[PDB]
Design an enzyme around this catalytic site. Structure first.
Site, PDB file in Angstrom:
ATOM      1  N   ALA A 186       0.818  -1.202   0.000  1.00  0.00           N
ATOM      2  CA  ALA A 186       0.000   0.000   0.000  1.00  0.00           C
ATOM      3  C   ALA A 186       0.855   1.256   0.000  1.00  0.00           C
ATOM      4  O   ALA A 186       0.438   2.285  -0.534  1.00  0.00           O
ATOM      5  CB  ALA A 186      -0.932  -0.004   1.206  1.00  0.00           C
ATOM      6  N   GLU A 204       4.821  22.261  12.707  1.00  0.00           N
ATOM      7  CA  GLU A 204       3.664  23.012  13.165  1.00  0.00           C
ATOM      8  C   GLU A 204       2.380  22.195  13.162  1.00  0.00           C
ATOM      9  O   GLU A 204       1.398  22.624  13.775  1.00  0.00           O
ATOM     10  CB  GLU A 204       3.471  24.261  12.306  1.00  0.00           C
ATOM     11  CG  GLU A 204       4.614  25.255  12.398  1.00  0.00           C
ATOM     12  CD  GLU A 204       4.395  26.487  11.538  1.00  0.00           C
ATOM     13  OE1 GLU A 204       3.381  26.536  10.813  1.00  0.00           O
ATOM     14  OE2 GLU A 204       5.244  27.403  11.574  1.00  0.00           O
TER      15      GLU A 204
HETATM   16  N1  LIG Z   1      -5.062   3.258  -0.563  1.00  0.00           N
HETATM   17  C1  LIG Z   1      -4.648   2.091  -1.053  1.00  0.00           C
HETATM   18  N2  LIG Z   1      -4.720   0.999  -0.299  1.00  0.00           N
HETATM   19  C2  LIG Z   1      -4.267  -0.096  -0.927  1.00  0.00           C
HETATM   20  C3  LIG Z   1      -3.762  -0.197  -2.198  1.00  0.00           C
HETATM   21  N3  LIG Z   1      -3.400  -1.504  -2.473  1.00  0.00           N
HETATM   22  C4  LIG Z   1      -3.697  -2.159  -1.377  1.00  0.00           C
HETATM   23  N4  LIG Z   1      -4.230  -1.362  -0.402  1.00  0.00           N
HETATM   24  C5  LIG Z   1      -4.705  -1.764   0.926  1.00  0.00           C
HETATM   25  O1  LIG Z   1      -3.678  -2.490   1.570  1.00  0.00           O
HETATM   26  C6  LIG Z   1      -4.260  -3.528   2.389  1.00  0.00           C
HETATM   27  C7  LIG Z   1      -3.676  -4.861   2.000  1.00  0.00           C
HETATM   28  O2  LIG Z   1      -2.361  -4.958   2.575  1.00  0.00           O
HETATM   29  P1  LIG Z   1      -0.994  -4.776   1.814  1.00  0.00           P
HETATM   30  O3  LIG Z   1      -0.457  -3.391   2.128  1.00  0.00           O
HETATM   31  O4  LIG Z   1      -1.069  -4.977   0.358  1.00  0.00           O
HETATM   32  O5  LIG Z   1       0.013  -5.831   2.447  1.00  0.00           O
HETATM   33  P2  LIG Z   1       1.498  -5.606   2.964  1.00  0.00           P
HETATM   34  O6  LIG Z   1       1.427  -4.840   4.272  1.00  0.00           O
HETATM   35  O7  LIG Z   1       2.253  -4.870   1.940  1.00  0.00           O
HETATM   36  O8  LIG Z   1       2.173  -7.024   3.215  1.00  0.00           O
HETATM   37  P3  LIG Z   1       1.521  -8.473   3.152  1.00  0.00           P
HETATM   38  O9  LIG Z   1       0.194  -8.421   3.796  1.00  0.00           O
HETATM   39  O10 LIG Z   1       2.491  -9.412   3.852  1.00  0.00           O
HETATM   40  O11 LIG Z   1       1.462  -8.839   1.678  1.00  0.00           O
HETATM   41  C8  LIG Z   1      -5.772  -3.407   2.225  1.00  0.00           C
HETATM   42  O12 LIG Z   1      -6.325  -2.632   3.281  1.00  0.00           O
HETATM   43  C9  LIG Z   1      -5.908  -2.696   0.879  1.00  0.00           C
HETATM   44  O13 LIG Z   1      -7.108  -1.938   0.804  1.00  0.00           O
HETATM   45  C10 LIG Z   1      -3.695   0.979  -2.997  1.00  0.00           C
HETATM   46  O14 LIG Z   1      -3.289   1.070  -4.151  1.00  0.00           O
HETATM   47  N5  LIG Z   1      -4.166   2.089  -2.331  1.00  0.00           N
HETATM   48  N1  LIG Z   2      -0.406  41.529   8.984  1.00  0.00           N
HETATM   49  C1  LIG Z   2       0.228  40.372   8.800  1.00  0.00           C
HETATM   50  N2  LIG Z   2       0.079  39.391   9.685  1.00  0.00           N
HETATM   51  C2  LIG Z   2       0.772  38.289   9.357  1.00  0.00           C
HETATM   52  C3  LIG Z   2       1.567  38.082   8.255  1.00  0.00           C
HETATM   53  N3  LIG Z   2       2.120  36.814   8.289  1.00  0.00           N
HETATM   54  C4  LIG Z   2       1.661  36.293   9.399  1.00  0.00           C
HETATM   55  N4  LIG Z   2       0.843  37.139  10.095  1.00  0.00           N
HETATM   56  C5  LIG Z   2       0.208  36.896  11.390  1.00  0.00           C
HETATM   57  O1  LIG Z   2       1.208  36.478  12.298  1.00  0.00           O
HETATM   58  C6  LIG Z   2       0.730  35.365  13.085  1.00  0.00           C
HETATM   59  C7  LIG Z   2       1.550  34.142  12.765  1.00  0.00           C
HETATM   60  O2  LIG Z   2       2.917  34.399  13.143  1.00  0.00           O
HETATM   61  P1  LIG Z   2       4.192  33.847  12.399  1.00  0.00           P
HETATM   62  O3  LIG Z   2       5.162  34.999  12.213  1.00  0.00           O
HETATM   63  O4  LIG Z   2       3.887  33.227  11.097  1.00  0.00           O
HETATM   64  O5  LIG Z   2       4.903  32.778  13.337  1.00  0.00           O
HETATM   65  P2  LIG Z   2       6.414  32.684  13.823  1.00  0.00           P
HETATM   66  O6  LIG Z   2       7.242  33.101  12.618  1.00  0.00           O
HETATM   67  O7  LIG Z   2       6.682  31.215  14.106  1.00  0.00           O
HETATM   68  O8  LIG Z   2       6.612  33.554  15.002  1.00  0.00           O
HETATM   69  C8  LIG Z   2      -0.757  35.256  12.776  1.00  0.00           C
HETATM   70  O9  LIG Z   2      -1.515  36.064  13.668  1.00  0.00           O
HETATM   71  C9  LIG Z   2      -0.834  35.786  11.347  1.00  0.00           C
HETATM   72  O10 LIG Z   2      -2.113  36.337  11.064  1.00  0.00           O
HETATM   73  C10 LIG Z   2       1.717  39.138   7.320  1.00  0.00           C
HETATM   74  O11 LIG Z   2       2.380  39.130   6.287  1.00  0.00           O
HETATM   75  N5  LIG Z   2       1.004  40.260   7.683  1.00  0.00           N
END
Ligand SMILES: Nc1nc2c(ncn2[C@@H]2O[C@H](COP(=O)(O)OP(=O)(O)OP(=O)(O)O)[C@@H](O)[C@H]2O)c(=O)[nH]1
Ligand SMILES: Nc1nc2c(ncn2[C@@H]2O[C@H](COP(=O)(O)OP(=O)(O)O)[C@@H](O)[C@H]2O)c(=O)[nH]1
Ligand SMILES: CC(=O)O[C@H]1C(=O)[C@@]2(C)[C@H]([C@H](OC(=O)c3ccccc3)[C@]3(O)C[C@H](OC(=O)[C@H](O)[C@@H](NC(=O)c4ccccc4)c4ccccc4)C(C)=C1C3(C)C)[C@]1(OC(C)=O)CO[C@@H]1C[C@@H]2O
Ligand SMILES: CC(=O)O[C@H]1C(=O)[C@@]2(C)[C@H]([C@H](OC(=O)c3ccccc3)[C@]3(O)C[C@H](OC(=O)[C@H](O)[C@@H](NC(=O)c4ccccc4)c4ccccc4)C(C)=C1C3(C)C)[C@]1(OC(C)=O)CO[C@@H]1C[C@@H]2O
Ligand SMILES: Nc1nc2c(ncn2[C@@H]2O[C@H](COP(=O)(O)OP(=O)(O)OP(=O)(O)O)[C@@H](O)[C@H]2O)c(=O)[nH]1
Ligand SMILES: Nc1nc2c(ncn2[C@@H]2O[C@H](COP(=O)(O)OP(=O)(O)O)[C@@H](O)[C@H]2O)c(=O)[nH]1
Ligand SMILES: [Mg+2]
Ligand SMILES: [Mg+2]
Lengths: 432, 429, 429, 432
Positions: free
Chosen positions: A12, A245
């Protein structure tokens, strides 16, 4: 400079990762031969020549699907020391994935991850793609999440896990594998995301009007969710977000860390006309229960926290208008102790369309990451499936015979029941 | 003489300054190369306050830029007016705050501040007679809260005589960007009340009104929102860079606006603001500027001034005008709104007149208010803080970085003591 | 008058000089043929100190090159500026040192020194009034330690009045090239303290910092590292080759820097150093040169000056400048860093001003410090020496060349007596 | 001007020397006819015409492999008075190599070496290639190392000896021959290098993906180690090294002089892409236990001294970064009395690729010469093999009957046991 490797476990994980890394090449103009005719520095390590390789580790216990990448179109892209295979599959068995087979090649995969960790300086976190039903994706993943919390610890380990469907189950032992792999990853994971198959069959039929979907068409819509989360690391945005985050804003209590994903808009090619698709129009499609990608009624629970990831031509003022209307509706209701339940992210790049795909070219899209208590009804149905089969001790001799104490099931079931009453603690309101 | 060192912190504080230094450069005629190409000789008369003259007659800004990840710093140096900054001043880290006050003030802030203070001190020695510092950051973010308030605690220990003011961004009532912003604001206000001479509270939500209700912009971006904040900042120090009939500066406004040492939170306002084509249907005189500085839809903080009472009012005017027509309007707004002020402060309006308008305009004004109407800003935060702390949610991201629960109780006790003071002087007489 | 004979030893000492004589040639306009093609008439005014005029108006360097194998000597004579040296001066052997002090000082050094001293004496007779000698070598190598210190023991027996200084390369703390370099350095410091008027300690590890932290070079080579050492060497004798307002030379610096005859180990520093494109964002004045000569990241020896105390400081300036602006900065660094100096030496800063800058620059400076912070350099070696001698490992490559174990004990006793002296005057007052 | 002749003894010496002198011609453009269409002056003596000949002496007791050089492609290259043969082989017998057969032609080989020693003025040392298992490579070499220390003495006599494998042994009497030839060369050799066959089968399978290697493919990788050590004499470098400098930096005590070789990178042609191979990347492959060319666990011992030989486009600053990280790891640990355990050499020329070979063209490579105490566990296994066979006095009548006193085995075994406890003296730490 802010690199982030990805891990794909089981069948998967690989078939999702085939559509994912197909999508990353088209969002940077990367040829399938690794060439291109540093914003992409997070997901690609440049060689000495003009060639870029993915920061991915494809691991599986059966040699079928790994050789398809070794022989398919994307052949000259990957490092062949990364495509790790196994002799035999775990064959829907947590015990073979955690005790018998997984203990043979776990030291090889950790060697490959640690070599990728050394050449990256701003390593943010890990991205594990697996499924709860499979033997490898539940057994080998539970072994893998143990070692990474021992070695690294301070890195944001994420999971886009495939949650087992309520009514459409292929493997019979899926109630066994999901209980065992959850008890192991609960002390190691950070924020595991849930995606169900059966809801995507509902979306592709109702919206896209595709009455014959395959696993390829499911892997396209999942890869859009993978793209929009990692879109802030790859492109400049007006209000960015980091993978550190997500685990801060979405996880209120250290046990409950299971949000769910929602993507919008999902419309066909000819339905791309006849509507304008504003940011106030596509935001209400996210909180619609028909578009949620887990078969659960959200009105049976309460939203704790919600992440919104906008991309494309998005006006920051009209996002403030769109969120304000949702807080005024009455079906959508939050929890009493949480007054601020939104995490807003805006990126400039529109989501591109894979050629030979099924989604239409739009100018904006929303990825919603919501953590609600509505999943607690689904865990109780999983415990009801588990208690019926285990009471007759069915399929147990395939687990005890592979190096496992039989009393270990009482450890995982009682911890899940203790996890069940934690949502009941969250569900009640405050006092006065 | 009287130089200003500019410090930028967080993601928002950097993107304001990237707009801010473009605004100041058009008031002095500075190309993106960094040379001088102005026309009026008054532009280089006081150029040394925001610039340092380099060899080859180029001018570099006295700016210090702080982040915890190289993401937004790479965006500024690659954008326009990114080639004007000195590459030594770009101080950054590799971990990233993760939108958290604990890792911004305890863990990674302590390992970065010594790299910053070796650059702050280098700009501090180069100035002839240093006026004071200014800071642009956030209160809901992780970097600008943690790393921002940590720098203020180190500066005031070294420079108690220098003025220290912050153009902080305060969270909004309706929408919320950071989920844990009642924790991030409360642990930052506890630092700002003991170490800042004055503080400019700015809400993004009040800026969304003026971009829609007044300027009628259908699609405003942050390049348009942060443009208004930078226009307020240049209007504060406009009487320090140009002569006027009645001059003011950062120190005069720090005395006439602060009656008590804990009450130094403001609300900024700018005038005139019209639409693009709708400017020809309105005259531009002094009573047209006065009637726009006092209505509630012009404040850059989401608070209604009609609830509380003003304590002091600073009006900073620009361009050629007449003093009687100022006092015709500055007295009249104190007569008809006679209940909305405070009684035991006579003539609580401060007048500042500069000679030079902005580039293109005819005249302008800048409103620096100080009222008890910002107690609703703290009562809204302190209600959200107690509604989240009583369940101890989102707390293991703070306890896991060495922080006891007494530290939260001290900030919550300090905020409620601030609310009681603004509650006192509102109903006092 | 006041001529200098230049001696090169070992592999490192030859590759420094191949860069060094290219540096001096651009200060005098000397083609690789050897003629004169300068433009300013002050270049040939004191040309005779480092050059001898030949027939046909060609100039040859007064250099002596020593090795024990023809490998690196073949590289120098085939490279650029290899056709400038006299082919008679290439003195070499056939055995090779094998990276060992015993075979460099006892066995093959004794059979080579008479071939060298017949060439040293030939250059000594040709000079009018000889100033003194200088030497470039290593301390971790086999040739530059053994053959190098042997030449110093023969010169001082003949020329006690001439100054003898070495631009030696001292081993690094973290990495190590020679395995037995605690033996090679200890048996060489025992010779250097009794026969050298002054000694310039240079670490390669301190040069890797400046090429990365300051100059931002991603890929520095030894052609870039040894370029900085040669820039320090030309800045020492720059006041002997050009007139200035206040002139100095090798003898004045040998008196003002050496208070006690055993304490003559230095630390060199050079200023200004910027990046390539990052020079336009900084003015080039005298306080820009002073603030770079005193921080710890500019010393070419891996030692932090903040631990110990300075004894004396030589500042050698180049280019047109003003004496007050020098003394504005030379006094200020003695007032604010008032504890970091020594107390019983008043005004321990020596000033030297030359008129001519280097080719292209506007002005420059050269720092010659003398501190008790180099006791960490000897305590790190003396700890590594006793940790290897107590097991008697790698000793049969020394006992097999006629060396008793008393000889090791004398060098280890001599080094600890040197450590106790720098330990004394650090805590003295 | 710094010449250095090489000696090749026995069948193992010649077949290595076939690949070695093939490699020296391609690193100078020398034709197989001696022509070329003086950096190479160390290994070639120019004739009067435009023809160069090797400074090598190929000696063997059996006439098979010497005639292959006399009839193969490299025929007009060698001096035919140097290709010394014998009537019959020693036939896995130290006594026939040291008493019976070797005493007949030892005076002829010393005549050929002394004529090469006269025309060279800067003669540094000797390079002896042999094997411990063979009759000639252990018997005739032990006779040869006696005479050279008597005649020359002050010359750096080196050995690239083939150490016998722990599990893969062809000759049954290899525990006899290795004990006897070590007791003789211990007072004559300077620094003998160890290369094992079985570890090269492990490297060529895992890295090169060659599941069918021959002795030709083993001789290519060994010749790269021979090339990188003698690379400093043949080319100009930024930090050179001499053959006299190896015996100074790598031999702490006059008994222990057995280091081991390690070469990196060893990758295939198609794996030359997909990775950048920096100097910090390929240095960690040297201290990996999987790439060490002696089957011994290095974590069971302690490193005394290590030589590093870089070649190609190598930045001297990043070497200082790469060594500094290795001293910070915890599995790699040195001995207590040795604080400085590195000898660094940088050459400019990249290692070339032989046509029709198996290694890919890279821009940099590392040859590591490490002397550790981890080999002391392997000597004790060799004494355990010796004491079992000698206790039943097996194969002794093939040794006493060829002119040898039977009590001579007690001389060599007790000296090896006294050599065994010397590593135990090194293994303990200091006092206070
Ligand atoms: N989203 C998604 N799920 C998939 C896909 N192919 C298989 N699955 C899911 O994977 C599960 C089957 O287990 P697998 O992941 O194929 O088995 P494995 O963990 O790789 O190993 P074995 O069981 O030992 O063969 C089921 O829940 C399927 O629905 C896919 O293409 N997409
Ligand atoms: N006016 C203004 N507010 C901003 C802008 N970017 C982020 N904020 C505000 O700043 C806050 C997020 O802080 P941020 O600087 O992204 O986080 P930090 O960098 O981890 O401290 C929120 O309240 C946002 O609305 C900007 O360009 N202009
Ligand atoms: C003919 C004329 O005067 O046109 C004006 C103009 O008419 C108006 C519409 C301007 C205009 O501003 C806007 O349209 C606007 C839109 C979104 C966000 C912010 C501004 C103007 O851009 C603003 C600009 O003003 C300036 O240049 C000031 O010096 C201003 N500097 C900048 O805005 C600026 C910034 C970056 C690059 C170039 C200029 C300033 C204001 C305060 C302090 C310092 C500087 C000019 C000439 C005009 C236009 C172009 C329409 C107004 O704004 C300002 C800041 O003056 C909007 O309200 C006023 C009313 C003005 O009349
Ligand atoms: C327009 C201009 O001035 O360009 C400079 C230059 O800008 C800079 C970047 C130079 C430049 O140096 C380097 O880039 C450099 C790199 C690695 C190692 C050493 C140097 C320069 O090469 C250095 C060189 O300086 C000189 O020529 C001096 O006279 C110098 N001689 C040599 O470097 C030299 C050596 C061999 C052949 C030719 C020149 C010198 C210094 C001290 C004492 C005597 C002579 C020149 C003109 C420049 C460049 C080219 C960029 C700097 O270095 C020197 C030694 O001046 C680096 O720090 C300074 C800052 C300078 O501004
Ligand atoms: N590395 C390497 N070892 C080889 C090669 N050929 C043989 N050997 C080893 O050499 C040993 C056998 O020694 P030989 O050289 O054939 O014997 P000898 O010393 O010439 O003496 P005789 O047997 O009497 O001819 C065994 O350990 C073989 O594994 C080769 O091509 N490479
Ligand atoms: N800075 C610098 N150090 C060098 C250079 N070459 C060698 N060294 C240093 O010199 C020491 C080795 O000495 P070396 O001259 O090669 O040995 P010797 O010739 O036998 O004395 C080590 O500390 C090396 O780091 C060079 O070009 N520049
Ligand atoms: Mg499977
Ligand atoms: Mg044989």
């Amino acid at each position: 400079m802010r690199e982030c490797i990805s891990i794909h476990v089981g069948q998967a994980g690989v078939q999702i990762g085939n559509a994912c890394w197909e999508l990353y090449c088209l969002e940077h103009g990367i040829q399938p031969d690794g060439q291109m005719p540093d914003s992409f520095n997070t997901f690609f390590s440049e060689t000495g020549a003009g060639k870029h390789v993915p920061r991915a580790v494809f691991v599986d216990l059966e040699p079928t699907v790994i050789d398809e990448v070794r022989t398919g179109t994307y052949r000259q892209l990957f490092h062949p020391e990364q495509l790790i295979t196994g002799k035999e599959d775990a064959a829907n068995n947590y015990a073979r994935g955690h005790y018998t087979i997984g203990k043979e090649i776990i030291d090889l995969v950790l060697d490959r991850i640690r070599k990728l960790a050394d050449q990256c300086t701003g390593l943010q976190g890990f991205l594990v793609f697996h499924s709860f039903g499979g033997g490898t994706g539940s057994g080998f993943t539970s072994l893998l999440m143990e070692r990474l919390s021992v070695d690294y610890g301070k890195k944001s380990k994420l999971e886009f896990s495939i949650y087992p469907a309520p009514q459409v189950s292929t493997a019979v032992v899926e109630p066994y594998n999901s209980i065992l792999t959850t008890h192991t990853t609960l002390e190691h994971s950070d924020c595991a995301f849930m995606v169900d198959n059966e809801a995507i069959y509902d979306i592709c039929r109702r919206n896209l009007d595709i009455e014959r979907p395959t696993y390829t068409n499911l892997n396209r819509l999942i890869s859009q969710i993978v793209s929009s989360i990692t879109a802030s690391l790859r492109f400049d945005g007006a209000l960015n977000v980091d993978l550190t985050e997500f685990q801060t804003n979405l996880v209120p209590y250290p046990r409950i860390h299971f949000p769910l994903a929602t993507y919008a808009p999902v419309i066909s090619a000819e339905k791309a006309y006849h509507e304008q698709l504003s940011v106030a129009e596509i935001t209400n499609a996210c909180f619609e229960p028909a578009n949620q990608m887990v078969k659960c009624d959200p009105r049976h629970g309460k939203y704790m926290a919600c992440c919104l990831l906008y991309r494309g031509d998005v006006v920051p003022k009209d996002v403030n208008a769109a969120i304000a209307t949702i807080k005024t509706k009455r079906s959508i209701q939050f929890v009493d102790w949480c007054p601020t339940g939104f995490k807003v992210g805006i990126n400039y790049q529109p989501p591109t369309v894979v050629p030979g795909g099924d989604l239409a070219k739009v100018q904006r899209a929303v990825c919603m990451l919501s953590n609600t208590t509505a999943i607690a009804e689904a865990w109780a149905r999983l415990d009801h499936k588990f208690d019926l089969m285990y009471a007759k001790r069915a399929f147990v001799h395939w687990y005890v015979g592979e190096g496992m104490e039989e009393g270990e099931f009482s450890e995982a079931r009682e911890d899940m029941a203790a996890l069940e009453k934690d949502y009941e603690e969250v569900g009640v309101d405050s006092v006065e | 003489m009287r130089e200003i060192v500019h410090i930028q912190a967080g993601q928002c504080g950097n993107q304001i300054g990237a707009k801010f230094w473009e605004v100041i450069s058009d008031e002095h005629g500075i190309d993106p190369t960094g040379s001088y190409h102005g026309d009026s000789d008054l532009q280089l008369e006081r150029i040394n306050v925001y610039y340092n003259e380099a060899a080859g007659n180029k001018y570099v800004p006295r700016a210090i830029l702080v982040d915890l990840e190289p993401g937004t710093m790479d965006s500024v140096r690659s954008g326009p007016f990114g080639q004007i900054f000195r590459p030594d001043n770009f101080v950054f880290g590799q971990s990233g705050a993760g939108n958290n006050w604990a890792k911004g003030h305890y863990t990674e802030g302590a390992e970065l501040v010594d790299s910053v203070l070796d650059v702050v001190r280098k700009e501090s020695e180069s100035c002839d007679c240093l006026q004071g510092f200014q800071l642009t950051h956030s209160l809901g973010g992780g970097t600008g809260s943690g790393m921002g308030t940590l720098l203020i605690s180190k500066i005031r220990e070294e420079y108690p005589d220098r003025i220290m003011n912050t153009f902080s961004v305060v969270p909004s009532p309706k929408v919320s960007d950071t989920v844990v912003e009642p924790y991030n604001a409360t642990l930052s206000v506890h630092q700002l009340v003991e170490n800042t001479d004055e503080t400019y509270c700015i809400d993004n939500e009040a800026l969304y009104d003026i971009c829609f209700r007044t300027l009628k912009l259908t699609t405003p971006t942050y390049g348009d929102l942060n443009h208004l904040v930078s226009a307020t900042m240049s209007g504060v120090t406009t009487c320090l860079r140009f002569p006027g009939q009645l001059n003011a500066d950062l120190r005069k406004l720090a005395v006439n606006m602060v009656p008590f040492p804990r009450l130094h939170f403001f609300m900024p306002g700018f005038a005139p603001l019209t639409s693009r084509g709708s400017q020809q249907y309105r005259a531009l005189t002094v009573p047209e500027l006065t009637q726009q500085m006092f209505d509630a839809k012009n404040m850059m903080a989401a608070c209604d001034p009609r609830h509380g009472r003003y304590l002091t009012v600073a009006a900073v005017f620009r361009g050629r005008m007449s003093m009687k027509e100022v006092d015709e309007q500055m007295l009249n707004v104190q007569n008809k709104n006679s209940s909305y002020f405070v009684e035991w402060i006579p003539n609580n309006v401060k007048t500042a007149v500069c000679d030079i308008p902005p580039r293109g305009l005819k005249m302008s004004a800048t409103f620096i208010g100080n009222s008890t109407a910002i107690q609703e800003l703290f009562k809204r935060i302190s209600e959200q803080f107690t509604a989240m702390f009583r369940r101890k949610a989102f707390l293991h991201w703070y306890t896991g970085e060495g922080m006891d629960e007494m530290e939260f109780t001290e900030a919550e006790s300090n905020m409620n003591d601030l609310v009681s003071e603004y509650q006192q002087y509102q109903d006092a007489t």
